[PDB]
């Protein structure tokens, strides 16, 4: 019915695996069809660009490459640790994500 | 619901259609099922004019392909209405 | 050849069995079948025309059920039948079956 995403634009994530294991950053974008996220300044790649109006002088640009969403973990804004998410039902009762290490909301 | 604006789809944009403006002949793409009598009325209520003559012809969609895939463009009808002496359809004079 | 409007008797299929030889019961060696082929047995259909309510009604009926038409006429006396068409009369009559 919908792809499940534990992370979203733009909470703060630890990149927990791959060349950039350890980095922290904001999620610029979430791509559910690919099950991927863009994290700011993580997975940079060099891309060739043709001499074009969009890019006179041509040469190359840097692009951020998507990461498999499973490589990424939200950092709790209360306790500051990378966490799994739990859901908690409020009194509304809307439901929310909460850090699983302490109890804080993650938004 | 059916209105004059469902009968006239778009004006015809071509050197041939423009050449008709001079003598009061306006050429529209119309709905393929529309009758001369009905187009007469539709044009008159949409452009506040008096239609004196209506010519219609069917235009077959061209066959076209993108790679592997053979297809066809939609079939169309075009209509050429003549307005009363002196009248003009300004939306078309345009150009 | 067809269907009895009264009994529903209809053509049926039968075998025609051809035999040669002397029956055992008569001291013979026995019967041998020299042929079996399908055939039909039809009802003995005939036409029966009757005046009922000043109209001429006709029935296609097996001979066995010829009296059943007249009995229907009797039972018809109790009916408002005058002025109907012969198709309509026949329906009322048949409905009595």
């Amino acid at each position: 019915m919908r792809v499940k995403m534990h992370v979203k634009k733009g909470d703060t994530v630890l990149v927990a695996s791959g060349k950039y294991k350890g980095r922290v950053g904001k999620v610029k974008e979430v791509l559910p069809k690919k099950y991927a996220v863009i994290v700011e300044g993580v997975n940079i790649v060099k891309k060739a660009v043709r001499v074009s109006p969009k890019y006179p002088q041509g040469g190359f640009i840097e692009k951020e490459a998507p990461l498999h969403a499973s490589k990424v973990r939200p950092i709790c804004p209360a306790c500051g640790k990378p966490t799994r998410v739990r859901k908690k039902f409020l009194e509304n009762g809307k439901k929310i994500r909460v850090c699983a290490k302490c109890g804080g909301a993650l938004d | 619901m059916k209105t004059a604006y469902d009968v006239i789809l778009a004006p015809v944009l071509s050197e041939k259609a423009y050449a008709g403006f001079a003598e009061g002949k306006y050429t529209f793409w119309v709905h393929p099922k529309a009758t001369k009598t009905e187009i007469k009325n539709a044009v008159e209520t949409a452009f506040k004019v008096k239609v004196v003559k209506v010519n219609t012809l069917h235009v077959r969609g061209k066959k076209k392909r993108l790679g592997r895939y053979l297809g066809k463009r939609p079939d169309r009808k075009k209509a050429i209405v003549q307005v009363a002496p002196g009248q003009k359809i300004e939306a078309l004079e345009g150009l | 050849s067809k269907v009895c409007e009264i009994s529903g008797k209809r053509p049926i299929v039968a075998n025609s069995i051809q035999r040669r030889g002397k029956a055992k019961r008569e001291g013979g060696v026995g019967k041998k079948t020299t042929g079996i082929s399908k055939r039909r047995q039809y009802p003995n259909l005939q036409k029966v025309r009757v005046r009922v309510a000043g109209q001429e009604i006709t029935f296609r009926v097996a001979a066995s059920h010829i009296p059943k038409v007249y009995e229907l006429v009797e039972r018809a006396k109790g009916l408002k039948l005058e002025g109907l068409s012969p198709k309509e009369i026949k329906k009322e009559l048949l409905k009595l079956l």
Partner: protein, 70 residues
């Protein structure tokens, strides 16, 4: 069209009478033709307008039908 403007269209439409709905559709169908013409000579950069209008007309006709349905 913005979601809030859609609600707003439905509320305003639902207050109208069949006849007023007919006039309004006819005007919107007219406004669509103007748009079509502009798209065809390349002067309609704001092309989302066409999808929009077409759905307003739907929504209105949908409501007209509500009104007449009983």
């Amino acid at each position: 069209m913005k979601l809030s403007e859609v609600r707003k269209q439905l509320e305003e439409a639902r207050k109208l009478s069949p006849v007023e709905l007919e006039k309004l559709v006819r005007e919107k169908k007219r406004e669509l033709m103007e748009l079509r013409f502009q798209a065809s000579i390349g002067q309609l950069s704001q092309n989302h307008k066409i999808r929009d209008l077409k759905r307003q007309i739907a929504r209105l006709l949908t409501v007209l039908n509500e009104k007449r349905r009983q």
